[PDB]
Amino acid sequence: TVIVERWWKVPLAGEGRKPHLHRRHRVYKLVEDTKHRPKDNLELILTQSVDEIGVRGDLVSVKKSVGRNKLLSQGLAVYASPENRKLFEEEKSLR
Amino acid sequence: QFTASRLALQNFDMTYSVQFGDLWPSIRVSLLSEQKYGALVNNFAAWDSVSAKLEQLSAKDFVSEAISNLRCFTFSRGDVSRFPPARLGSLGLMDYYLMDAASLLPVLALGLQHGDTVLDLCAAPGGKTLALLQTGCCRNLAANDLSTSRTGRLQKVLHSYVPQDIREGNQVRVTSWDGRKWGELEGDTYDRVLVDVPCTTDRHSLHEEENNIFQRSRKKERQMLPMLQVQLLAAGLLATKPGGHVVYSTCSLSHLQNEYVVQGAIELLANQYNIKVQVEDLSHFRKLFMDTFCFFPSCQVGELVIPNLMVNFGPMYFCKLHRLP
Amino acid sequence: GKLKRVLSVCPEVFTMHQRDIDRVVKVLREKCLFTAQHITDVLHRCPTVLQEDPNELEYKFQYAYFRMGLTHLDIVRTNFLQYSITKIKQRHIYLERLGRYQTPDKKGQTQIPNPSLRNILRVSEAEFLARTACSSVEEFQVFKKLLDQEEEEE
Amino acid sequence: KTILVKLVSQAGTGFSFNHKRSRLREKLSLLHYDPIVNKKVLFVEQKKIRSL
RNA sequence: GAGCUACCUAAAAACAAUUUUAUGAAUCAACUCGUCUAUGUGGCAAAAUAGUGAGAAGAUUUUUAGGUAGAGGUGAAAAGCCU
RNA sequence: CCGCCUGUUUACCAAAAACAUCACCUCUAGCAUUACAAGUAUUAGAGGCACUGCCUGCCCAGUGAUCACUUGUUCCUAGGGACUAGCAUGACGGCUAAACGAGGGUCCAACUGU
RNA sequence: AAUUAUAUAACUUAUCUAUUUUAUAGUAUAAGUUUGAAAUUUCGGUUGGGGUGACCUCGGAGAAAAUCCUCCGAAUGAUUAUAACCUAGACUUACAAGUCAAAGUAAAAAUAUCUUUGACCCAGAUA
Ligand SMILES: [Mg+2]
Ligand SMILES: [Mg+2]
Ligand SMILES: [Mg+2]
Ligand SMILES: [Mg+2]
Ligand SMILES: [Mg+2]
Ligand SMILES: [Mg+2]
Ligand SMILES: [Mg+2]
Ligand SMILES: [Mg+2]
Ligand SMILES: [Mg+2]
Ligand SMILES: [Mg+2]
Ligand SMILES: [Mg+2]
Ligand SMILES: [Mg+2]
Ligand SMILES: [Mg+2]
Ligand SMILES: [Mg+2]
Ligand SMILES: [Mg+2]
Ligand SMILES: [Mg+2]
Ligand SMILES: [Mg+2]
Ligand SMILES: [Mg+2]
Ligand SMILES: [Mg+2]
Ligand SMILES: [Mg+2]
């Protein structure tokens, strides 16, 4: 997402009121474009055996592209939500 | 919309080509290209130290080699190496003067004799003075320049090189008055006098855009140059004592500004004032300096020097005139 | 046959990346205003042009177009681009200072007939100095060094 | 040509004043009044400011 | 705002007599245009009238309906024309 | 004299020597479902320019002569190789050419209240 | 001419997909670079009207306190044993800027002579 910032100051409006804007308050400068940020990883718990990643019940940190396109869409994995973690850990312990 | 330099080039092509015939291409190329400088030691503090340093660089004094009070170091034949900039000496004077070696010919061939007095009619900053001051072992001297700022420029040069004690002697006096008017003031005063009339400065004229004699406004000034040159030469001829020597020097190549100027001075001197000037041959001088200088003997009067790429030290024209009475 | 000569002189034409080939062609078209047929002629005649980087080919062409007053056809006919810039400047500048060469005027006329381009470049230096310029070999060597100093100062 | 240079007090104080010297001669050094110490002390050239 | 004018689309229409031939040929009406002179100049007319002139089977002329719109359109280029 | 010719133009001060025009020349483009075009290099678009014949036509690498050297352009180190034999100039003038014109001039005859 | 220019045309780097064992393909977008279809804005003064020339600030000399009157020079340089702080009273002057200086205090054992540029804003440098 593109994030912008005013060049010109906007005077304070008050507590319940809204500022009145002028045509000079429509000039912006770009502070950041989020698409260029370093990428993160996605946490998932495997539900079925898969090559080179794991077998079952093991949390895996994967690239967002792979996790959203292959594992979750095909049903091989589930979100590492607190509830999903709790169910899988109990099954592992009993096993 | 021709620039000043283009006008200078156009005028030279039409005339110099005819005068010099097949040599014009050789002369033309050697002007537009780089010039060669010759280092002249200051004697004084730099008599020994710098001369050894320059020799270690293989730069060789042509005057010293020819003799085999003036020593000027020059590079080998066809050597393009430059000279390092002048450096400040321990004693408080500048190490050496870098100038066009050919510019020193009028001094070398002036036949200096001890116990004399000399005048520089028009030497604005010229080393022709500073070099003379080195030659002026036993000579009172005087300097005159038409301009004001250029006169002060000379005095600054004198400070850097000439030690004060010598300057304190009356040998160094600064004046700025019209040369022709100066003739009336001091008639038959000095044995030897050097008159360097303002010339076309062809080398500078092409190179320098500013204050070029070939500008449209200065056309009248350019046209009248020969007449003014004659007036200055005649005034010096009167000023020199009976039996004195004078030398007429110019930077230009024009036949009009070299032979006609001197012939008019001799003719004007010959008739009106009942005086005779007899020229002194420099042919032997020509042969001695063959190695380091390039020239052609066609000119009836004077020893004109031309620029050659092998030895790019031209152009210098200098004629010697001795007043017999 | 055109491919045969190109392959022999410039074996890397196939290896070169797309970007490199396009820039050489684009310079010849947009900046040099060469026609479609001439472009094929130049590539076949002097394959080494492809190796040469841009911003040097453009300078070489403009040197002839403006300073030397040559035309598009003359450049193609004589294989001007084949020669090195150092040779062009060393010889042309020497003649110009001597007064033996003149840039054509606005009208397109020259007071003196200019020397043929083949005599300037194609012939050997010894013949070029002896015949085209009628100069001395030593003078040219001095001039080359003097020109080198000027470029260094530039 | 001449160059403007900054002479710095060698008293341990930072006091300085600007002087002129020709670029041909050597670096300058001088005696001058130092207000903070209230004595005459040496000032030695440390930096070049501009060319005039 | 293209009912005037510029160019285009669709559907229609007119061209006698004479000589040549077999045609952007010829003489000359209808019809289209507007060379030259006089009258007129708040005129019959905000560009006309009277004579005299150019073309007249063709790149001809004419009717009906539709299209292109102003930072634009149209132009056998007069910086012409678009109430 | 100018323009090849029939045509066109400043509605309301210019109809012409200007614009267009057959002819000739340069440049750009290898392709489909709304123009070009239901088309494809003898095609399409953009631009210049009278036609016709007639003199003037020269940047092929030089000399030997399909052959050897000398050049040139490149590399590998002043030596050593590689390449240049699958091609081969051009730039003006005087021309007009009969016809044609409400074009701009000169002249003879006739004619007349100019 | 100055200022811009996701008109087009190219590239490059990311982003998103494919593959590939790093790798070449592409690309509903963002950031750069290259071209420039266009867009907004302007046309110093005195010299008859032109045409070439010039000239516009400060100082010196003549006319003598006028001039488009007659001339020369300046946008520094050299030497300096290094020239502080504080403060009566004055010159010059539309404003702005520019000159000279007693007493007191302080360093030393008092002034460097030659003799001529540029406001404010806004950016610097170091301590
Ligand atoms: Mg209609
Ligand atoms: Mg109608
Ligand atoms: Mg009929
Ligand atoms: Mg009409
Ligand atoms: Mg007719
Ligand atoms: Mg008719
Ligand atoms: Mg007809
Ligand atoms: Mg027109
Ligand atoms: Mg007009
Ligand atoms: Mg209207
Ligand atoms: Mg016609
Ligand atoms: Mg007609
Ligand atoms: Mg029409
Ligand atoms: Mg009209
Ligand atoms: Mg007509
Ligand atoms: Mg009319
Ligand atoms: Mg026409
Ligand atoms: Mg007509
Ligand atoms: Mg008659
Ligand atoms: Mg006091």
* Three-class SS state of B83: coil
Residues 90-109 (C) near nucleic chain F, CB < 7 A: none
Give the C-alpha separation, C9 to C4, whole Å.
9
CB D44, CB D7: distance < 8 Å: yes
Q: Shortest CA–C1' contact from C38: which nucleotide?
A: F27
Is B126 annotated to bind a ligand? Reply is: yes
Cα dihedral C35, C39, C45, C46 in deg (nearest 10): 120
d(CA B80, CA A32): 59
Q: How far is the CA of A20 from the C1' of E32 (A)?
A: 71
Q: Rounded to whole angstroms, how far apart are CA atoms B62 and B78? A: 14
Structural tokens at position A58: 């093991």
For chain B, list residues whose CB is within 8 angstroms of any CB belonging to chain D.
88
φ, ψ at B51 (rounded to 5°): -60, -40
Which DSSP string do the residues of C45-101 spell out, in sequence order?
Answer: H-GGGGTSPTTTHHHHHHIIIIII---HHHHHHHTGGGS-HHHHHHHHHHHHHHT--
Neighbours of B95 (CB within 10 A): 21
Whether residues C139 and B33 touch (CB distance < 8 A) is answered with: no
Task: Give whole-number Cα distances, B123 to B247, B286, B302, C141, in Å.
Answer: 13, 25, 20, 37
Place of tokens 């028009």: B122
Task: Report CA(B94)–ligand 12 centroid distance (Å).
Answer: 94
Contacts of A91 (CB under 8 A, 6+ apart): A57
- Dihedral pair phi/psi, residue B37, rounded to 5°: -100, 155
Phi, psi of A20 (to 5 degrees): -95, 125
Residues whose CB is less than 8 angstroms from the CB of residue A90 and which lie 6 or more positions away in sequence, other chains included:
none
The answer to whether some atom of strand G lies closer than 7 Å to the beta carbon of D39 is yes
Tell me phi and psi for residue D20, to 5 degrees: -115, 140
What's CA B72's distance to the chain center, in Å?
15
Q: Torsions phi, psi of B138, nearest 5?
A: -125, 45
Q: Decide if B236 contacts B246 (C-beta within 8 A).
A: yes
Find where tokens 């903070």 sit.
D36
Straight-line distance from CA B250 to C1' G25, in Å? 78
User: What gap in Å lies between CA C33 and CA C23, rounded to an integer?
Assistant: 14
Interface subset of D 1-52, CB within 8 angstroms of B: 24-26
Q: Would residue B299 show up in a list of annotated catalytic residues for this protein?
A: no
What's the Å distance between residue C147 CA and nucleotide E61 C1'?
79
How far off is chain D from B88, nearest CA to CA, in Å?
Answer: 7
In angstroms, the separation between the Cα of residue D39 and the nearest Cα of chain B is: 31
Around A25, how many Cα atoms within 13 Å sit in the side-chain half-sphere? 7
CA gap D14, D9 in Å, rounded: 6
CA-to-C1' span, C99 to E70 (A): 61
* Pair type for strands B72-74 and B60-61: antiparallel
Q: Residue A72 to residues A45, A49, A50, A62, B122: CA-CA distances in angstroms? A: 10, 13, 12, 12, 100
The CA-based dihedral angle spanning residues C14, C18, C24, C29, taken in that order and rounded to the nearest 10 degrees: 120
Task: Copy the structure tokens of residue D28.
Answer: 């300058």
d(CA B286, CA B294): 9
Among candidate residues C53, C120, C56, the one with its CA nearest the CA of residue C89:
C120
Total length of chain C? 154
What's this structure's resolution in Å? 2.9
With tokens 């092509």, the residue in question is B13
- What one-letter code names the amino acid at C26? K
B22 in a known ligand binding site: no
Q: Tokens 């080195």 label which residue?
A: B134
User: Which has the closest alpha carbon to B69: B42, B97, B89?
Assistant: B42
Q: What are phi and psi of B290, to 5 degrees?
A: -60, -40
In angstroms, the CA of D14 and the C1' of G121 are apart by 31
Q: What are the angstrom distances between the C-alpha of B120 and each of B161, B172, B182, B264, C70? A: 18, 11, 12, 21, 54
Q: Alpha-carbon distance B103 to B192, whole Å?
A: 18
Q: Which of B251, B294, B299, B319 is catalytic?
A: B251
Q: Tell me the pairing of strands A28-33 and D2-9.
A: unpaired
Round to whole Å and give the CA distance between C73 and D40. 82
CA A81, distance to chain mean position in Å, is 13
- In terms of Cβ atoms closer than 10 Å to its own Cβ (0-12, 13-18, 19+), residue A1 is exposed
- The rounded distance, in Å, linking the Cα atoms of C152 and C60 is 19
Axis-axis angle for helices B24-32, C85-98 (nearest 10): 120
The verdict on whether residue B111 carries a ligand-binding annotation is no
Measured between alpha carbons, how far is A72 from A83 in angstroms, rounded to an integer? 17
Distances (CA, A) of B126 to B122, B212, B226: 9, 19, 21
At B124, list the tokens.
Answer: 């604005």
Q: What is the CA radius of gyration of chain A?
A: 23
What is the number of residues in chain B?
Answer: 325
Is B95 marked as binding a ligand? no
Q: What separation in angstroms does the CA of C29 have from each of C22, C25, C34, C66, C75?
A: 10, 6, 5, 18, 15
* Torsion from C-alpha of A6, A12, A14, A18, nearest 10 degrees: -30
Q: Which helix (H) or strand (E) holds D47?
A: strand D39-51
Q: What is the DSSP letter of C14?
A: T
- What is the token pair recorded at B34? 């780089």
Structure-solving method: cryo-EM
β-partners of residue A28 are A6
| Buried b / exposed e along B275-287 (16+ C-beta atoms within 10 A) | bebeeeebeeeee
**Cα–Cα distance, B221 to B224 (Å, whole number):** 5
Of the candidates B240, B253, B134, the residue with the CA atom closest to the CA atom of residue B188:
B240
Q: What's the CA gap between C27 and C31, in Å, rounded?
A: 5
What residues of B are in contact with residue C99 (Cβ under 8 Å)?
13, 24-25, 28
Most B CBs within 10 Å: which of C91, C95, C98, as the mutation test of the B interface?
C98
Nearest C-alpha of chain B: how many angstroms from C138?
8
Neighbours of D5 (CB within 10 A): 18
The Cα D21–Cα B260 span in angstroms is 50
| Chain B residues within an 8 Å CB radius of C143 | 29, 33, 309
Strand order from edge to edge, sheet including B240-250: B174-175, B139-144, B116-120, B190-196, B240-250, B317-323, B277-279
DSSP letters for A18-71: -PPP-GGGG-EEEEEEGGGSPP-EEEEEESS-BTTTBSSS-EEEEEHHHIIIII
In this structure, the number of other CB atoms found within 10 A of the CB of residue C152 comes to 7
How many angstroms separate the CA of residue B92 from the nearest CA in chain D? 9
Residues of chain D contacting B88 with CB distance shorter than 8 Å: 24-26
Tokens representing B224?
Answer: 């009248």
Q: How far is CA B164 from CA B88, B126, B169, in A?
A: 17, 19, 9
Residue B89 is labelled as binding a ligand: no
Alpha helix positions (H), chain B: 4-20, 24-32, 49-56, 62-67, 105-108, 127-135, 149-161, 164-168, 179-185, 202-207, 219-223, 225-239, 261-271, 283-288
Chains that touch D (3 or more CB pairs under 8 A): B
CB-defined contacts B:D, below 8 A: 3
The verdict on a CB contact (< 8 Å) between B309 and C98 is: no
d(CA B47, CA B65): 17
CB B212 within 8 A of CB B5: yes
Spatial CA neighbour of B62 closest among B100, B26, B113, B88: B100
**CA gap B42, B71 in Å, rounded:** 9
Residue identified by tokens 């410039």 is: C10
Supply C63's token pair: 């040197």
D6 CB closer than 7 A to any strand G atom: no
Q: Please answer whether residues A72 and A44 qualify as being in contact, where contact means their C-beta atoms are separated by less than 8 angstroms.
A: yes
Q: Which bases of strand F sit closer than 7 A to a protein CB?
A: 27-29, 59-62, 70-74, 82-84, 86-87, 90
Q: Chain B, 140-179: which CBs lie within 7 Å of strand G?
A: 147-149, 156, 159
Torsion of CA A71, A77, A81, A84, to 10 degrees: 170
Report how far residue B319's alpha carbon sits from residue B247's, in angstroms, rounded to the nearest whole number: 5
Q: C84 beta carbon < 7 A from strand F? A: yes
Distances (CA, A) of D29 to B36, B175, D8, D10, D37: 39, 37, 9, 11, 19
| Three-class SS state of D27 | coil
Strand-pairing partners, residue A27, are none
Give CA–CA dist B130/B182, Å, rounded: 22
State the Cα angle at A21 between A16 and A24, rounded to 5°.
155
Nearest CA to A62 out of A75, A79, A37, A81 is that of A79
Cis peptide leading into residue B315 (ω within 30°): yes
> How many helical (H) and strand (E) elements, i.e. helices and strands, does chain D have?
0, 4
Tokens of D17: 């004043």
A1 alpha carbon – ligand 19 mean position (Å)? 101
